């Protein structure tokens, strides 16, 4: 054949730290369907937002938003443990159906995105060239995000542990922990991997008595 009807750009969803995760690759023939299992970003997260994106960039913010919906009622669990199956199905009319289902709770939500949605022909070409020009930067970004996400997880577990510790935690330690949490927060907004890892360390150094407390029966 000299003509194939295809989805012109990659389609996927936003995942923790502003990353596009692709479910259907650019230039896939239609009709087509693919599924991938995702999980929660934080301990005891009760809901997830499925932000649907079209484009080739690894930074979610530089792709085209097609829609979003939420799925709630996720039962309490450690982050990473719930199984949220997300399915993209593009039919022969180019209509995109996106669903998310939590395997433990059985709850599901879906949206339908009409075929005219997303980028036009001129924006499609610009997008492909944009991603080609930014391929190395986007590699660096994904590295930065793995470190940001560790940073983010430590900040949350530490805050949870301070709450649970309450007045068992000495006043000098809480002050030092508070400062170090704020510092980690600030670093996480920059693009410097070493700076994040550095504040993670500074937080750990003031956290020994806390770790001891969290650890006992």
């Amino acid at each position: 054949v000299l003509l194939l009807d295809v989805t012109p750009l990659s389609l996927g969803i936003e995942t923790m730290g502003g990353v596009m995760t692709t479910l259907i690759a650019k230039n896939t023939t239609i009709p087509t369907k693919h599924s991938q299992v995702f999980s929660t970003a934080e301990d005891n997260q009760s809901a997830v937002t499925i932000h649907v994106l079209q484009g080739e960039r690894k930074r979610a913010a530089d792709n085209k938003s097609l829609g979003q919906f939420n799925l709630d009622g996720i039962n309490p669990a450690p982050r990473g443990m719930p199984q949220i199956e997300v399915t993209f199905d593009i039919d022969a009319d180019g209509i995109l159906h996106v669903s998310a289902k939590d395997k433990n709770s059985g709850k599901e939500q879906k949206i339908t995105i009409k075929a005219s949605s997303g980028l036009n022909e001129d924006e499609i070409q610009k997008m492909v060239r944009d991603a080609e020009a930014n391929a190395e930067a986007d590699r660096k970004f994904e590295e930065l995000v793995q470190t940001r996400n560790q940073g983010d997880h430590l900040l949350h577990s530490t805050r949870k542990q301070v709450e649970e510790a309450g007045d068992k935690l000495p006043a000098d330690d809480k002050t030092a922990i508070e400062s170090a949490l704020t510092a980690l927060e600030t670093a996480l907004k920059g693009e410097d991997k070493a700076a994040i890892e550095a504040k993670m360390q500074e937080l750990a150094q003031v956290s020994q008595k806390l770790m001891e407390i969290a650890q006992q029966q």
Binding site: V37, F38, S39, V48, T49
Partner: peptide, 13 residues
């Protein structure tokens, strides 16, 4: 293994 999803945005602070 699985990639992680963000939570819905709460009301503005």
């Amino acid at each position: 293994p699985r990639p992680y999803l963000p939570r819905p945005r709460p009301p503005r602070p």
